[PDB]
Amino acid sequence: VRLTFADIELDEETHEVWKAGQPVSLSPTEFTLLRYFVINAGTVLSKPKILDHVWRYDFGGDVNVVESYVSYLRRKIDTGEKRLLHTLRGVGYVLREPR
Amino acid sequence: VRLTFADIELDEETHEVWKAGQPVSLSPTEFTLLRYFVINAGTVLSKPKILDHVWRYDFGGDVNVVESYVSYLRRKIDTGEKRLLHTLRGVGYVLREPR
Amino acid sequence: DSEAVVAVDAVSFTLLQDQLQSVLDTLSEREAGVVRLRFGLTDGQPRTLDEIGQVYGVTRERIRQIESKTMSKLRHPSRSQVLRDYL
Amino acid sequence: SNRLVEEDVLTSIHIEEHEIDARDTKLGAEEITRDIPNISDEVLADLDE
């Protein structure tokens, strides 16, 4: 039942995450972001549905906080400038293997 | 579910295009124009109802914007002077393989 | 005569307007006004975000957020079923 | 008497024809297709593709 995509492995029981076989420590909110991002791999994820589903509806903060979140995800697993979690202008981000 | 026409092909998920098998990056609103063109393939497109549906009803600009955008579509995929995206004088444009 | 009023769709449009007013009044007043002037219901012109900010003293990002709140609450099946029938 | 109704003594087969043409138009072309907007499925059961 473990969720795997390319080189990212996740276990839903103890919430540990493996990048290319190397375990990394990850924050809970970013863990939910990553879980959603794999569970909808192959479909672009834009911000409004990110705040709608992943985050609470009482969230009154700015839009830059989720950007900082995806920034920590970038520096966590796909540190390269070209990364598995690509971005789209105005349509948020998506995790797919580059072609 | 990917929508195809002649040598242009579209995936509805990650908003990219293949032109004769070559992936091409394109602007968002320009992509919406192309989406209208493929979703009404074989049917002529006029600037007004193009403005009505694709663009917001609050658009206060001039009419040269759509002509320029069609020029971008030409220079991106149909670089040839004769092109699959034919233009009708006073009636607009159409996506059609020339006879 | 194609230009003649159907005299049936007119009453349908009026009742649809009544349903829209009831639905909007059920929503919070700030959201109702925001969407009403966003789609130009009470006036002849829909307005861009900066007009909404100038008339409500907020930034355009806040208006985008409240619009997100509006169509999020509007997807509620209580309104979705009661309005989707009108087609 | 109901015998005429039951025994089909006086009953007639009546046939009507309904022409309909799709023609060229400045808007494009009119298609004889099942891509009919805003229709249910119980009424789409008896149509071919």
UniProtKB/Swiss-Prot annotation, chain C:
- Annotated DNA-binding residue span(s): 49-68
Superkingdom of origin organism:
Bacteria
Q: List the residue ranges of the region (Sigma-70 factor domain-4).
A: 23-76
Q: Tell me the compartments it is located in.
A: Cytoplasm
**Further remark:** Was identified as a high-confidence drug target.
Q: How does it assemble?
A: Interacts transiently with the RNA polymerase catalytic core formed by RpoA, RpoB, RpoC and RpoZ (2 alpha, 1 beta, 1 beta' and 1 omega subunit) to form the RNA polymerase holoenzyme that can initiate transcription. Interacts with WhiB3 and probably with RbpA probably via its sigma-2 region.
User: What protein family is recorded?
Assistant: Belongs to the sigma-70 factor family. RpoD/SigA subfamily.
What name does the UniProt record give this protein? RNA polymerase sigma factor SigA
Q: Which organism is it from?
A: Mycobacterium tuberculosis (strain ATCC 25618 / H37Rv)
State start and end of the fragment within the whole protein.
441 to 527 of 528
From Swiss-Prot, chain D:
**Superkingdom, natural source:** Bacteria
Q: Which family does it belong to?
A: Belongs to the RNA polymerase beta chain family.
- Role according to the record: DNA-dependent RNA polymerase catalyzes the transcription of DNA into RNA using the four ribonucleoside triphosphates as substrates.
Question: Can you state the subunit structure given in the record?
Answer: The RNAP catalytic core consists of 2 alpha, 1 beta, 1 beta' and 1 omega subunit. When a sigma factor is associated with the core the holoenzyme is formed, which can initiate transcription. Interacts with CarD, TRCF (Mfd) and RbpA.
Q: What is this protein called?
A: DNA-directed RNA polymerase subunit beta
Q: What is the source species? A: Mycobacterium tuberculosis (strain ATCC 25618 / H37Rv)
Q: Which gene encodes it?
A: rpoB
> Whole protein: which stretch is covered?
738 to 786 of 1178
